[PDB]
Design a protein around this ligand. Structure first.
Ligand SMILES: Nc1ccn([C@@H]2O[C@H](COP(=O)(O)O)[C@@H](O)[C@H]2O)c(=O)n1
Ligand SMILES: Nc1ccn([C@@H]2O[C@H](COP(=O)(O)O)[C@@H](O)[C@H]2O)c(=O)n1
Lengths: 222, 220
């Protein structure tokens, strides 16, 4: 079985007042609903576990629950939220962790992640070459160096794992600031394989992001 | 004094526009004109040198050419286009290299870059923390590492330089295929300083970028 875990249980940004980025509306619909639709339309996800703010567990069950979608109370950080979601994941072979702010992620991208895991990769991440040159900077903001742009990937979600590989990684070190699940797995040198991402799987968090997302909805739906 | 070199000689292939990308319109105005309007609005640019596709040089001169508004035939890639335009940079103590494709770049950012040069920095690049986590990968797509996102910058243009530093960097370039001017300066060992970028200085590269630029303008 393949389970998708969706941490939608809060925010470290004080501006947002504990409201997850996942609950922002897009075309009158929360980002989380768009993300769930993508996961379901991929046709490769058996169950989804969504971690939500504890106060909104009842509300989320009613709105986002279903035969393939389990709701759990989330944690104080993202790392705890994913950990709590993993409890309810059961005995899945594959676990995908998906950022619900990447609302317009195409279903095909999600299938690509699962397909690569079935080829035998333990850890799979969608990515694209960065549009801008990326530079390493020191604490001063002085350039340390410029890696080959073609040797870099801006990575997206869902990030896919063999379940035990992911659970072992989550078993150690809280350090809640982690947003990238593959990074946790990489601490032991576990191989991670990039598959093609998609420009549409951008994270929707800023006003400019939301402007782009609304514009995409217009082309797709109006 | 400050001269802006504007590489505008790129093709419209990725946009499928059937014309050079500089001459694709955004709310009815060519991208190049948006880029020039930003430079003019900043109030800190004394001279512009535009590299255009070589076949359009004569026509471009008729439209844009005049005192301190110089058109040169561009090159086979961005590196050659910049190198050609540098020949026309003139006496300015500071040179900015600004993609025509970053059409919505705010005048404020251009002013921020010039200010940092005037402050005494030899090379200045606008940058923002990457929106996504960045991973280094090998040729087969296997992950090599995930540098802390906080220690990375996704860089934009204009990139600003003391004129002598940029000329010396370009003199030492042995091949094209460079899209980042600061990378050539880094090869001299010259320190490069990052200043705040701006989300609106994104490069219009794909059809989706063009949708974004249109949607931004639609708001205003
Ligand atoms: N307590 C928390 C805090 C953040 N998160 C998740 O971590 C990610 C990053 O959140 P912020 O950048 O808003 O802090 C989001 O996907 C958010 O839903 C969570 O699931 N539980
Ligand atoms: N041969 C080339 C190729 C690109 N360029 C310019 O460099 C900038 C970056 O090009 P792309 O946006 O195509 O990557 C654009 O403004 C483009 O017009 C150029 O001036 N000469």
């Amino acid at each position: 079985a393949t389970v998708a875990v969706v941490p939608a249980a809060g925010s470290g940004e004080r501006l947002r007042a504990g409201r997850p980025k996942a609950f922002v509306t897009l075309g009158g619909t929360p980002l989380l609903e768009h993300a769930l639709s993508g996961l379901r339309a991929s046709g490769v996800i058996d169950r989804i576990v969504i971690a939500v703010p504890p106060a909104l567990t009842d509300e989320s069950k009613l709105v986002f629950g279903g035969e393939d979608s389990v709701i759990v109370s989330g944690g104080v950080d993202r790392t705890e939220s994913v950990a709590l979601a993993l409890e309810a994941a059961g005995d899945a072979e594959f676990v995908l962790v998906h950022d619900a702010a990447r609302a317009l992620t195409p279903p095909a991208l999600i299938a690509r992640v699962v397909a690569a895991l079935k080829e035998g990769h333990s850890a799979v991440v969608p990515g694209l070459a960065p549009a801008d040159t990326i530079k390493a900077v020191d604490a001063n903001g002085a350039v340390l160096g410029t890696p080959e742009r073609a040797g870099l990937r801006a990575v997206q979600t869902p990030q896919g794992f063999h379940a035990d590989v992911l659970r072992r990684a989550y078993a150690r070190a809280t350090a809640g600031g982690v947003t990238d699940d593959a990074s946790l797995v990489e601490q032991l040198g576990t191989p991670v394989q990039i598959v093609d991402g998609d420009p549409l799987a951008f994270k929707i968090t800023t006003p400019l992001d939301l402007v782009l997302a609304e514009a995409v909805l217009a082309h797709h739906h109006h």
